[PDB]
Amino acid sequence: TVVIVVSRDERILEELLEVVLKSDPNVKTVRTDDKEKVKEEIEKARKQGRPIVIFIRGATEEVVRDIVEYAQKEGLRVLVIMVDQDQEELERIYEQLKKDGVDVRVTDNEDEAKKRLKELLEKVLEH
Amino acid sequence: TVVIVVSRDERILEELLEVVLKSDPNVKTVRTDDKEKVKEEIEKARKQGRPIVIFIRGATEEVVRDIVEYAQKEGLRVLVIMVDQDQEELERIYEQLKKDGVDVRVTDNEDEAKKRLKELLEKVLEH
Q: How many domains does chain A have?
């Protein structure tokens, strides 16, 4: 009933939106990162009795959580397709680095990266 | 000797570059996604006998592989810091979706996403 396509890549969201619009012009589509706009459209999708595909970047874990909960409490089925193009290319880089003897550290934010880099230079700039 | 900071996020690369420039102005830095420019700078880093931090977006697995091999065959130590801010936020979304009963599919490219979405609509648009 409610399909959510999640991707940080705007170009990918555009292309998938196109695929939906050109394949079956009868399913509703909405491109927005605004939770309210989403709810407003899900409802119109209800009145018109049509399925809806939502295109979002995420990635707020709260925004996706709300949308999923909102639709479920109305008995709407929720299907999700996540597209993480980045993830997979980074994964291969990581493997090769490890493949060699490279001491690789994967950080999840600049704050963490900052700490590790400083700690790295504070101990490499030393001879 | 050679530090490579990999991140798809330009703003993160900028901030880390800043951290290096403001903390120890004696270590060489280079921001480029061009393999040749990198080699040209690694060498200058050699002549001047200084360590170097390279800031790249990647994520070509070939580009990172070459740089790592180039420096190693010169007996340079290679340390890497990868910063994947995206990955971690997507990871949490995925968990919540799974937390609920959401049938979630993670695709690694639009080609794959296209197939799965079409297959999804070809079977949902059906009553």
A: 1
